[PDB]
Amino acid sequence: LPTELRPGTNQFLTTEDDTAAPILPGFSPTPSIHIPGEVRSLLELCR
Amino acid sequence: LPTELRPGTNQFLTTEDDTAAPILPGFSPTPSIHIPGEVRSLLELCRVETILEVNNTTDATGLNRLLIPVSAQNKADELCAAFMVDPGRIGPWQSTLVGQICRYYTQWSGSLKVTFMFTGSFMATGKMLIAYSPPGSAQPANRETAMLGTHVIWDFGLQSSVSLVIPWISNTAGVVTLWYQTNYVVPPETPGEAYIIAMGAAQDNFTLKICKDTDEVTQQAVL
Amino acid sequence: LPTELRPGTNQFLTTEDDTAAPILPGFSPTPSIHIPGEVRSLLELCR
Amino acid sequence: TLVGQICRYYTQWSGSLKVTFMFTGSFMATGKMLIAYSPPGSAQPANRETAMLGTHVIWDFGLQSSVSLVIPWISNTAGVV
Amino acid sequence: ETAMLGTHVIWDFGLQSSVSLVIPWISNTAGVV
Amino acid sequence: TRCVMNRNGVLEATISHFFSRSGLVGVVNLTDGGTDTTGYAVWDIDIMGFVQLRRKCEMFTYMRFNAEFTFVTTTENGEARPFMLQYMYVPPGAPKPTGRDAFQWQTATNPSVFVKLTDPPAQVSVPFMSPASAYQWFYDGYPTFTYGQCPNNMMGTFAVRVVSRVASQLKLQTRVYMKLKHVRAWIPRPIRSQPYLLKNFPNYDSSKITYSARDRASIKQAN
Amino acid sequence: LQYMYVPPGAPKPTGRDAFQWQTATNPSVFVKLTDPPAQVSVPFMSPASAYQWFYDGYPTFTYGQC
Amino acid sequence: TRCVMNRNGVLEATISHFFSRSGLVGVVNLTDGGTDTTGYAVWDIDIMGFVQLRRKCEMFTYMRFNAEFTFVTTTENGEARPFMLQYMYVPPGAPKPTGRDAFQWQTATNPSVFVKLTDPPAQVSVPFMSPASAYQWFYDGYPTFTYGQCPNNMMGTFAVRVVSRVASQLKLQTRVYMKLKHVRAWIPRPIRSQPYLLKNFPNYDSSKITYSARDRASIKQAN
Amino acid sequence: AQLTVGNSSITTQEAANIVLAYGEWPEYCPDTDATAVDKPTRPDVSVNRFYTLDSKMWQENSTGWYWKFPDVLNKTGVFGQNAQFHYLYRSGFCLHVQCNASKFHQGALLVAVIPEFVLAGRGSNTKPNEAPHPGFNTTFPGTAGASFNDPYVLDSGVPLSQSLIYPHQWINLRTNNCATIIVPYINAVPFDSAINHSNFGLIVVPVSPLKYSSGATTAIPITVTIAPLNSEFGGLRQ
């Protein structure tokens, strides 16, 4: 598959949203539980 | 097709899972056969009963390190032996596959099974108290304060191979103690000095997490 | 389209099977004919 | 032999072989040869007798000229004929 | 050893006392036990 | 006391994940000069070199997998300069390179890969190359139609050089890192506790016999 | 270069050429310096369901260390 | 005795896989200077150059395939420096370049490819260029309307230079590697046993006639 | 009870408390190219008989004993005759180990099968030309079977305490004086040499030393009986 590059390669935007290699593959984190006092947006605090 | 790159190119993660060019294309390996004794996870090993090096001392040199002595020359209502329940610790578990495999991992959790085996005469008879004291406590002083917790009795004069289920453990730890509920009853003409074997393994509910290498192997390499 | 590279780039495996740019595009080779005495595998010779 | 030549072009081979023999004398002549195969892991036979006690054939080339033989197995000392 | 390679039985008389055995044939040197 | 109560998942416990996380097994040095060196280097493919996974490999007997090798390089100094190398794999039963410019390097059946040194490290995928259905880390019995050398564990070897007729005055130290794909084990073995003495043979010192569990004061005192 | 991550409860490298760098369970990533910077993704590594920025109470079976 | 019993697969035995595994056939040297050299180099496309696949190619008579050439380069020293080269292919029946800056390099019908030397080696795909349905490695009979020269086996040639009007004081050794795609053979031939004497003609020494099988003591002693 | 096979007959207790090594029964070799080209012989008539080796004398200071299969049978009857005259071999085994002791003896023995059991070259001297390998007599003891020297390490550099992942069984002089294992063919290649490669090896070790009173028997007799299963031979060499 032939391709080309364009400007924007090899740069590191502090704002951009991209993945990265998960260095602990197959890993299993500790599952979550229904912790009361959750939030989803700071607007909840501002009121 | 125009594209762009992003950070993460040309790097070599020792952990990442990726393919590579198969340098022998079209190759045909030797096909597999139904080899008995297969495995699929080390947990299968961790639920197998191995022996504990419970007699850990400087005075026992060989197999004697694995045998709990018992005699009628000891009195009743006294402590015979005891140990901790801590596989990945410096104690009489490092001889056990559970402890060995815990050394290969950071955090474990679950329930365990500790069994004991007696080997004396058929005619002999006694009664041992097998008392477990959960962590956050001290090992019992006497038999009485131990009887007030998760304990079993064991009249090895009748039933030899005894077992026990420790409910929980994770990562001080719980203790297991063996007391003379009675004296070693003995008929005439028998030495009246026997040995108890202590075996241990993990139950199904056990689980392991992040892997780490071990320390007991002090050698970097050999060649 | 943002992407990343991985180890194995710019290398030349003497074994790998890949295409290359056909430098004579649209070219028309001489067509084949039913030449007797064909083969498809050296095992035919070994018997 | 092309089998040997082509084996030189590869590491591991396996299977069964066919060895044949052809006689060329007179039509009127006649004899009898023993063609004895001794599988590997053994020594070539000392005499005809210890060879007759294994995979063998006879061959009265006075009647039947072009004789054949099938060696069962080989892979990669070896068998003897 | 050379006896174990023929018609033989074992007998752990610690458990089973009265043991038997069947000799197959005889007529009229003879067999040994 | 952060006594966890939550069952963790079982995916790290699989042999697959127990032989993942590519690590190193071999480091070689390659200096190029005149008639006072070799200008090339040869390394036989080995597993039991570094004793951390030799312990994890003897934990079973029979194994079968595919290899994923990665060759990284640098100067002993550390700098990365634009030179073109040549790695070549050699399958078993094939002559190894004896000299820099010898003919084996120009061999076709021998596979090879050409890279720049300013190129990211190279990757390759070796398949299961044994004649047998599996590798045997233990072959009690002579291979003769000096003892215990497995007739089939040689994956082959590797050879490294630079591609030039000039003696490029260069000193490199090449590190390899090996990943295992699609492992399948069989017949678990108990883990070795004694330090090694030499490769490929499981000898041991019958005098400085180490004990698996360290020593405490008595048996009636846990801690 | 060589960056290596070390999970908790594991010995840290004491020297340049010490043995911990040659460790497998310790993950690591090798890059060129003329290579764009490296990226990695750490997952939630706590034993607990969450991190606690405040743990009033001694961790003993010197104060407040989570 | 590792006497294997398992039938292995037949995919390596195919002519396809017997002419795969791209290898080299040609190495050229290119030095650039003033009026004491050429500054360029020409190499006619050849097959029977290196005698390992000449044996594999005479194993049949008539063949048809597509070529996959890869041009790798370096300095005789070994270093890779940022210079722009020019490879050009020349089809048969076309004039070859006589000088560095001669006009043939500026030719359109002649295809060419421009790369950096710090660029990974170049690849190209030549199709079947014979007038005939296949190549003939043997053409007993004069081509006249000095003997046996096949009228159609010339794939063409190649020419290499750097792109500059300055005499860049540079000494390169270029290696080519050739892969064969979609081979189709015909009429197998027996393998030649005698060493060669000169190219393109299957002569042989009628005095030092080598024997295919070496010599033993008798016929009644195998070994 | 009693078990009679071929011409041999050995009595024991009634028991289905018997271990299957890795949970599979023995079985003949399925279709391979060897199974396709020729029929390797399937003797099932007389080679299958409960062979009874020489008794062993367990004492107060005994280390333990072991054997090597099929090397223990390489010179024993018709089976040995088939073993040294066929370079292809395959089989399973029924190992019935008995001890004959009174109720006044104490001591505990461990029965275990080990595949690819490799003995260790003791006498540490790191040297290529020295290489103190164990000799032919030791690594291939043959019929009698040798003893141990360092049981806590199994004379193999491997701790005994973890040796229970192996198919094992306890012999306690109180509860039972007998035990039995069944082991199938354990090798990474269907056939092999019966004479220069042992597939596995039995071990018996006193994990609780024998003890007794004044006037008792000082040596416990331990016997082992063995019966092959579904064996197969190939390639009659002379």
H or E element: which one contains I139?
Answer: helix I136-139
| Token pair in block for residue H141 | 């009979």
Strand ranges (E), chain D: 15-18, 33-36, 56-59, 70-74
Q: How far apart are CA C41 and CA H14, in angstroms?
A: 4
Give me the CATH number covering residue I168: 2.60.120.20
Contacts of E6 in chain I (CB under 8 A): 7
Q: Where are the domains of chain B?
A: 1-223
What the block records as the tokens of A43 is 């607007």
Instruction: Please provide the distance, in angstroms rounded to a whole number, between the alpha carbons at the two ends of chain G.
Output: 33
Do E and G touch, counting CB pairs below 8 Å (3 needed)? Answer: no
Find the CB nearest I196 among F62, F141, F212.
F141
DSSP string, C1-47: -EE---TTTT-EESS------BSSTT--PPPP---SSB-SBTHHHH-
Q: CA–CA separation, I212 vs I2, rounded Å?
A: 31
Could you tell me if E31 and E23 are in contact, meaning their C-beta atoms sit under 8 angstroms apart? yes
B25 contacts in H (CB within 8 Å)?
A: 20
Q: At which residue do the structure tokens 């030791």 appear? A: I138
The number of residues making up chain E comes to 33
Interchain contact, B193 vs I174, CB within 8 Å: no
d(CA H117, CA H129) in angstroms, rounded, equals 29
Residue H7 distance to chain B (closest CA, Å): 9
* Residues I138 and B126: beta-carbon distance below 8 Å: no
Question: Is D36 strand, coil or helix?
Answer: strand
The per-residue b/e assignment along D57-70, b for 16 or more CB within 10 angstroms, e otherwise, is: eebebeeeeebebe
* In contact, B118 and B171? CB cutoff 8 Å: no
The DSSP-derived string for chain F is: -----PPPPSSTTBHHHHS-S-B---EEEEEE-STTS-SEEEEE--SSSBTTHHHHHTTBSEEEEEEEEEEE--BSS-----BEEEEEEE-TTSPPP-SSSSGGGG-SSS-EEEEETTSPPEEEEE----SSSSEES---S------S--SS----EEEEEES-SS---EEEEEEEEEEEEEEE-BSB-PPP-SPPSSTTS----SSS---SS---S-SS---
- CB proximity G45 to F under 8 Å: no
Q: What DSSP element (H or E) covers H90?
A: strand H84-90
Residues of A in contact with G47 (CB under 8 A): 30
- The Cα B56–Cα F221 span in angstroms is 11
Task: Nearest chain A residue to B17 by CA: give it.
Answer: A25
Nearest to H179 by CA among H90, H71, H43, H60: H71
**E strand segments, A1-47:** 4-5
Partners of chain D (3+ Cβ pairs below 8 A) = C, F, H, I
Q: Which of I218, F141, F20, C16 is nearest to H1 (CA)?
A: F141
Query: What residues have CB less than 8 Å from I225, skipping those under 6 apart?
Result: E10, I10, I50, I51, I52, I53, I95, I96, I97, I98
Single-letter residue type at I67: W
Residue D10: its chain H contacts at CB < 8 A? 12
> How many CB atoms sit inside 10 A of residue B79's CB?
21
Q: Given an 8 Å threshold on Cβ–Cβ distance, is I149 in contact with F147?
A: no
Segment (H or E) for A43? helix A43-46
Nearest CA in chain F to G49: F6
Q: Which among B4, B13, B17 has the least Cβ separation from residue A9?
A: B4
Contacts of I152 in chain B (CB under 8 A): 62-63, 65
What is the rounded (10 degree) CA torsion for F19, F23, F26, F31? 160
The token pair at H69 is 């050439």
Of B167, B161, B48, B138, the C-alpha closest to B99 is B48
Residue H118 in 3-state DSSP? coil
Q: Looking at domain B1-223, does it have CATH number 2.60.40.3140?
A: no
Question: Could you tell me which residues are beta bridge partners of residue I205?
Answer: I110
Chain H residue numbers with beta carbons less than 8 Å from the beta carbon of C47 are: none
Asked if H12 and B30 come within 8 Å (Cβ–Cβ), the reply is no
Omega cis (within 30) before H92:
no
Chains in contact with chain C (at least 3 beta-carbon pairs closer than 8 A): B, D, F, H
Q: Residue H9: list chain B partners with CB under 8 A.
A: 28
Output the CA–CA distances (angstroms, integers) from residue H29 to C12, G59, H89, H159, H168, in the order listed: 21, 74, 17, 12, 15
From residue H216, how far is each of D45, H219, H220, H223 by CA, in Å?
19, 8, 10, 9
Cβ neighbours for D60, distance < 8 A, ≥ 6 positions apart: D30, D31, D32
**Whose CA is closest to B112, among B147, B84, B139, B136?**
B84
What residue numbers bound the domain in which I20 lies?
Answer: 1-238
How big is the B-F interface in CB pairs under 8 Å? 198
- Would you state the structure tokens that stand for residue D12, as one six-digit string? 């591991």
Q: How far is G62 from chain A (nearest CA, A)?
A: 27
Nearest to C4 by CA among B13, F125, G1: B13
- Measured between alpha carbons, how far is I144 from I142 in angstroms, rounded to an integer? 6
The answer, for E24 touching chain I at a CB cutoff of 8 Å, is no
C41: chain B residues, CB-CB within 8 Å: none
3-class DSSP state of A44: helix
Which residue, B7, H15, H66, is CA-closest to A11?
Answer: B7
Contact D12 F131 (CB under 8 A): yes
Cα angle at B170 between B167 and B172, to 5 degrees? Answer: 100
Residue A3 three-state SS: coil
Q: Taken in order C16, C17, C18, C21, is the CA torsion positive or negative?
A: positive
Tell me if residue I136 falls in helix, strand or coil: helix
CB environment H183-199: b (16+ within 10 A), e (fewer): bbbbebeebeeeebeee
Question: B28 and H11 in contact by Cβ < 8 A?
Answer: yes
* Cα B168 to Cα B150: distance, rounded to the nearest angstrom: 13
- Host H or E run for residue I224: strand I220-234
Tally the C-alpha atoms within 13 A of residue F153's C-alpha that lie toward its C-beta.
Answer: 18
Tokens coding F216: 């405490």
Q: Who among B5, B7, B13 is closest to A23 (CB)?
A: B13
Contact F185, B20 (CB under 8 A): no
Do I134 and I121 contact (CB within 8 A), yes or no? yes
- CB-CB: which of H1, H8, H12 is closest to D41? H1
Which one, of D17, D15, D71, lies nearest residue D39 by Cα? D71
Q: Which tokens go with I109?
A: 């023995």
Residues pairing with B198 in the sheet: B116
User: What does the alpha-carbon distance between residue F77 and residue F75 come to, in Å, rounded to a whole number?
Assistant: 5
In whole angstroms, what is the distance from residue B30 CA to residue H6 CA?
Answer: 8
Chain F residue with the nearest C-alpha to that of H12: F109
Candidates D1, D2, D16: best to mutate against C (most CBs of C within 10 A) is D2
Chain F interface disruption, residue of H1, H2, H174, most F CBs within 10 A? H2
For the record, the structure tokens of D6 come out as: 């082509």
How close are the terminal C-alpha atoms of chain A, in Å? 55
Measured distance CA(A29)–CA(F33) in Å, rounded: 53
CB H160 within 8 A of CB H30: yes
Helix (H) or strand (E) holding H86: strand H84-90
What lies within 8 Å, CB to CB, of B65 at 6+ separation is: B53, B55, B56, B57, F211, F213, I152
Go through the domains of chain F in sequence order and give each one's CATH number. 1-223 (2.60.120.20)
Chain D residue nearest residue H1, CA to CA = D41
* Amino acid occupying residue C21: A
User: What stretch of H or E contains I138?
Assistant: helix I136-139
Among B162, B78, B74, B77, smallest CA distance to B118 is for B162
Backbone angles phi, psi at I153, to 5 degrees: -115, 0
Q: Which two tokens stand for residue B52?
A: 């504990």
**What is the token pair recorded at H72?**
């790798």
Smallest Cβ–Cβ distance between C7 and the set B3, B12, B24 belongs to: B12
Assigned token pair, C46: 């070994």
DSSP letters, chain B, are: -EEEE-TTTT-EESS------BSSTT--PPPP---SSB-SBTHHHHTS-EE--TT-SSS--SGGGG-EEEETTSPSSSEEEEEE--TTSSSTTTTSHHHHHHHTBS-EEEEEEEEEEEES-SS-B--EEEEEE-SSSPPPSSHHHHHTSSEEEE-TTT--SB--EEEEE-----EEEEEESS--B--SSS--EEEEEEEEEE-TT-EE-SB---SS---SB--
Is residue I202 within 8 Å of I67, Cβ to Cβ?
yes
End-to-end CA distance of chain D: 16
Helix H or strand E encompassing E8: strand E8-9
Residue I89 and residue I91: Cα distance in Å, rounded? 7
Q: For the range C39-42, what are the long-range contacts, defined as Cβ-Cβ under 8 Å and sequence gap of 24 or more?
A: C39/H15, C39/H60, C39/H185, C39/H186, C39/H188, C40/H14, C40/H15, C41/H10, C41/H13, C41/H14, C41/H15, C42/D6, C42/H13, C42/H14, C42/H15, C42/H18
| Tokens found for residue B179 | 């007391």
Structure tokens that stand for B73 in this block: 């020359």
> Is the CB of D47 inside 8 Å of chain I's CB atoms?
no
Chains G and D touch (3+ CB pairs under 8 A): no
Q: How many domains in chain I?
A: 1
Chain pair C-H, CB pairs under 8 angstroms? 85
d(CA A16, CA A19): 10
Q: How far is CA H169 from CA H32, H75, H118, in A?
A: 5, 11, 17
Method by which the coordinates were obtained: cryo-EM
* Residues of C in Cβ contact (< 8 Å) with B18: 6-7
Any bridge partners for residue I106, and if so which? I211
